[PDB]
Amino acid sequence: LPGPDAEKWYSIMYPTRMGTPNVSKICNFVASCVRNRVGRFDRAQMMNG
Amino acid sequence: MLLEPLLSGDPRMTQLAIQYQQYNGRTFNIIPEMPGSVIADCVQLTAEV
Amino acid sequence: TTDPCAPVKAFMTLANMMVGFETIPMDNQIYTQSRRASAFSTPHTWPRCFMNIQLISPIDAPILRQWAEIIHRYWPNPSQIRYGAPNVFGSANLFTPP
Amino acid sequence: EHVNVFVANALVGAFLSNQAFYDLLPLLIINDTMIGDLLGTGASLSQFFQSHGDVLEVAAGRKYLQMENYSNDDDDPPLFAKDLSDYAKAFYSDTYEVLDRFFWTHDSSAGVLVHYDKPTNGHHYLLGTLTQMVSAPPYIINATDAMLLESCLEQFSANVRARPAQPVTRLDQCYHLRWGAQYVGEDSLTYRLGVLSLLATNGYQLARPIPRQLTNRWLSSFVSQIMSDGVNETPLWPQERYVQIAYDSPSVVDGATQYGYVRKNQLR
Amino acid sequence: ARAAFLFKTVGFGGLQNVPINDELSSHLLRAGNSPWQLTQFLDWISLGRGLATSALVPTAGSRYYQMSCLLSGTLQIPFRPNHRWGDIRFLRLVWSAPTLDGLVVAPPQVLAQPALQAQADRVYDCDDYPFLARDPRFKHRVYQQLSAVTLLNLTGFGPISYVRVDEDMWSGDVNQLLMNYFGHTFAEIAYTLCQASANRPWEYDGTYARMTQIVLSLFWLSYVGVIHQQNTYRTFYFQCNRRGDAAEVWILSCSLNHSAQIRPGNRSLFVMPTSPDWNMDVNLILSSTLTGCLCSGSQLPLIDNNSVPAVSRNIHGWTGRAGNQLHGFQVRRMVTEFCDRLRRDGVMTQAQQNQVEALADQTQQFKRDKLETWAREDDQYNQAHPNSTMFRTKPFTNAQWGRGNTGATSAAIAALI
Amino acid sequence: EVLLLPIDHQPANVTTPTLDFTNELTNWRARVCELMKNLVDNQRYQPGW
Amino acid sequence: YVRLDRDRVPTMVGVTRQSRDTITQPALSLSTTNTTVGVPLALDARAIT
Amino acid sequence: YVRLDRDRVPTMVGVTRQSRDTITQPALSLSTTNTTVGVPLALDARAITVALLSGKYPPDLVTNVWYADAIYPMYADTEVFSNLQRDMITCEAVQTLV
Amino acid sequence: TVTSPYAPSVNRLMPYRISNAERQISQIIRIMNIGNNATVIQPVLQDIS
């Protein structure tokens, strides 16, 4: 994201990226999700460079 | 220069070729035949060792 | 010049100058005889009248008919020549024999 | 050799009007087709021919010519406004669908008429101008209605004088209105003339005698009869789609032609 | 060039009236009172980038069917023999102006008066209506959507598309126009083409018509799998990164690797899906809409009588005694045909084929479950309310979930080239 | 795509125009002038000049 | 060099870096973005004549 | 334009923006819920006559060249392209309001 | 005469096409705005002149 700060955005945008050390509610919810739906997954690259 | 044009985008590649197209639609594709590479063979040899 | 559309440009520059004195048919309604000659830069812009000389009336456009005949008959023809020593120095030709 | 009728007429007119006619001579002899040759010229005098793509526009010349002693008398023959400078304008093409597509982007408020039988020089539409006929008082008749009336009277005379073994130039002499019904009222002279044209085409005959040479008084009487009160007591009504022929009518124009006429089986 | 302008209305799916009511009609006319809702449908489907849904419009095919039903139920008023336009009402709706410009709420007197009882599978001629006969441009503008409705209502399966291959179609103007769509998608191309056709009706053999036919042929050839990156039709093809996905996106592309050899001549045929899951495929509906827009002034070949039900036979402009056959297919099996053709061509591997198969199976399962649930809900609503019965999607039967003539259709489309 | 005009339009056929009198406006001017000539030559008006 | 054979005029020249057994993104080379076959270059007619 | 046909002379041009008591169909209320528009503008006969009597062309005029020179600067504007978007927004606003 | 390129491109977005209904509605609104008032329409004629 273009802006003064990005650490907060990188954690807000992708909930599934966080690790799950304990049995809190947030960690349970994160552990109950899939692992292969995050970030980009399709592109239209029509030219080189 | 040495391989700099290959780093412009998507370095993942297999083989080089060149083509041109006529007005009716026909194309001519030229694929040079790679003779070999002594360095590449030597590098793979050290992988065995 | 190496421009492949050069013969067409030679024809259309005279056709532009003959507007109001001679007329030739055109394919579509969008383009007319007043289209600038420098705009015929691609092979898809070649008019039907230039390709088929029989569509130019020798009565309506006498001079333009002759100009088309000169281009189709006396335009220079390409040729070939040999160079280098392919037996020792090899060659770097791609689309032509080495 | 075959000569081009358009070029012949234009040449005679230009020579009589003292205009540049020497350019029309090389076009006198037909090469492949009349309309094609006129379409391919591109640049001509342009007071005779204009090319709108694949449709050729031709001005319509006079059919009658007055002398000095014409005085709009009762016994003078009617001229139907075809003696003025420009009463109508013809558009020639090769196909009626092309003509119809052409009239998508052209004014047609005056009215478009057509002969579906053997045309004079091929498929063509006719558009009237804003001239008037004033030789039949107390009525003022515009050009379109004038030509409709003339064609209707010719067809009625032909129906009266028809014989089984006598050839005729055209089976149907009536003009059919194709475009422009938006500007025509339901109680108007144009509508009533269209009805009369259908009747004449289907083969009705007038009860009153028709003189061999027409007069202004007779024409005025006929128009007054048309505009009198009453109703249409026949099962025939005009439509712009096609000319409809009753099942038991003596006409055979549908067999002769290939487009325009449709026979109705249920209409008896 | 077309000479006869006829169209067919929708038929009752077991009910006793047109399957539409006041709620659905209001939801359709929510943002505009014009019954001609092609642009509104294009906006609603949102370029086919995702799965559109709503409470009253579960799928895009649902909205398409509802548009067809509304037009079928409403057009029967001015097409009565008396030809009056604004004296009777249909579901608290009346025409505004004789030129059929919009629908408005009925006046109090007409509301008190009884409504019109519509009929099923009526066939009408546009030239019968005086105003349509008088105005050619108006008739040509309306007949595009009328033809799309007819192409949807002709049979009980999904919409019908026309595929034609002919080398003489290509020309300089066609090449120049086609080159401009290098990176766009099928949905965007369809949007622009449909808007242009709406602005101006095309002529018989115009540049836009020829390019539309070429685009349809390219899309269908790519869909079957005859044309790909290593085997192009004059260096043109369609690429799909995720085959078997719920919402597939196809992109026009050029490649100089190889050009296939095309036999001279002119060939054509008619394609349609049979499985109910076509309701969630924007590309097929858009292809059918493009064919309908083409049908305004092109006079496509006739359809054989034996391929349509009895009520659709001997239509003057559409069906005939001896005509072309309709080829129907199933999407899930066509995916397998695509994968097999690519593998035989040698540009795909077994693992990739397995992944595509798994994704296609998952998508089919999901769509089948959703469609069955919606059908059951519609049935329950019809049972509850006996005076305002409706359908939200075109009715289907259990037998339509099996493979039909998919192999024959694939073989025919392959032989087209 | 249509414009209406209160006068007749005849497209020109040459790009080098010269003077021409075959026009409706020129005819109008000629008719007005000849009408005024007739008025002057009338025998109930001339004797006063 | 063709003379007046329109169906055989070259129009496009491109370079590919993938083998002819795979389906990948259509990453066309930069040389294909020219209206002519190559980079345009102007000349003075008077000097040549 | 009508030349001398009095029956076809236009006498009223009107637009509507509302509706009457219970009339719902615009074709039934346009006749009686419209306001006339139009205005006369006066000119001077002397100036028109002088212009009609005194007119000349440049000494050596070639129409195609003259118009190709004159029209070229005028066709570099995009205000019509802007007006199209303005019209779209206007119609959108009207429908949103209703 | 104007010219356009002939080559692969980068997917420009130039929204400028609307419908005849929108054009007609805007024209009607403009005619409603200019009603019976000469001073509102005279400068337009001046600009055209």
Nearest to E277 by CA among E380, E365, E186: E365
| Residues of H in Cβ contact (< 8 Å) with C19 | 64
The DSSP letter of residue E273 is E
Q: Please judge whether H26 and E95 are an interchain contact, meaning their C-beta atoms are less than 8 angstroms apart.
A: no
| Residues of A in Cβ contact (< 8 Å) with B8 | 48-49
Residue D179 in tokens: 């475009």
Chain C residues contacting E via beta carbons under 8 Å: 28, 43-46
Domains of chain D are 1-268 (3.90.1810.10)
Please report which helix (H) or strand (E) contains residue D94, including its range. none
- Indicate the SS3 state at residue E200: coil
| Residues of E in Cβ contact (< 8 Å) with C44 | 172-173, 175-176
- Indicate the SS3 state at residue E271: strand
- Strands D124-128 and D88-92 turn out to be antiparallel
Residue H39 in tokens: 């205005």
Interface test with chain G among I6, I11, I12, by most G beta carbons within 10 Å = I6
Experimental approach was cryo-EM
Nearest CA in chain G to E346: G21
Neighbors of chain C by Cβ distance (3+ pairs < 8 Å): B, D, E, F, G, H, I
F11 touches chain D (CB under 8 A): yes
Q: Residue holding tokens 């209707």?
A: D152
Closest-CA distance of chain I to residue C39, Å = 7
Q: Please judge whether H63 and F6 are an interchain contact, meaning their C-beta atoms are less than 8 angstroms apart.
A: no
| Residues of A in Cβ contact (< 8 Å) with B10 | 45, 48
Give me the resolution in angstroms, 1 decimal.
3.0
The DSSP letter of residue D114 is E
Nearest CA in chain B to C42: B23
Q: What is the DSSP string of E232-247?
A: BSSS-EEE-SSTT-SS
Number of H helices, E strands in chain C: 3, 0
Q: Please judge whether E235 and B27 are an interchain contact, meaning their C-beta atoms are less than 8 angstroms apart.
A: yes
| Residues of H in Cβ contact (< 8 Å) with F15 | 62-64
Measured torsion, CA atoms of residues E59, E63, E66, E68, in degrees rounded to the nearest 10: -120
- Indicate the SS3 state at residue E96: strand
Count of residues making up chain E: 417
- Round to whole Å and give the CA distance between H5 and D131: 9
Outline where DSSP puts E strands in chain D: 49-51, 56-59, 88-92, 112-114, 124-128, 132-133, 141-142, 176-179, 243-245, 261-263
Neighbours of H57 (CB within 10 A): 11
Count of residues making up chain H: 98
List Cα–Cα distances, G1 to B18, B39, C1, C4, C5, in angstroms. Answer: 18, 41, 11, 8, 11
| CB-defined contacts A:B, below 8 A | 6
List Cα–Cα distances, E222 to A7, E186, E252, G14, I8, in angstroms. Answer: 45, 12, 10, 23, 20
- Indicate the SS3 state at residue E102: strand
Nearest CA in chain H to E102: H25
Interface test with chain D among H1, H3, H64, by most D beta carbons within 10 Å = H3
Measured torsion, CA atoms of residues E140, E144, E146, E147, in degrees rounded to the nearest 10: 120
F6 touches chain H (CB under 8 A): yes
Question: E–I contact (≥3 CB pairs within 8 Å)?
Answer: yes
Residues 6+ apart with CB under 8 A from E245: E359, E363
Q: Please judge whether E235 and B20 are an interchain contact, meaning their C-beta atoms are less than 8 angstroms apart.
A: no
| Residues of D in Cβ contact (< 8 Å) with C59 | 26
Nearest to C55 by CA among C32, C27, C83, C76: C27
Q: Please judge whether E127 and D241 are an interchain contact, meaning their C-beta atoms are less than 8 angstroms apart.
A: yes
CA atoms within 13 A on the CB side of F5: 4
Q: Please judge whether E239 and G26 are an interchain contact, meaning their C-beta atoms are less than 8 angstroms apart.
A: yes
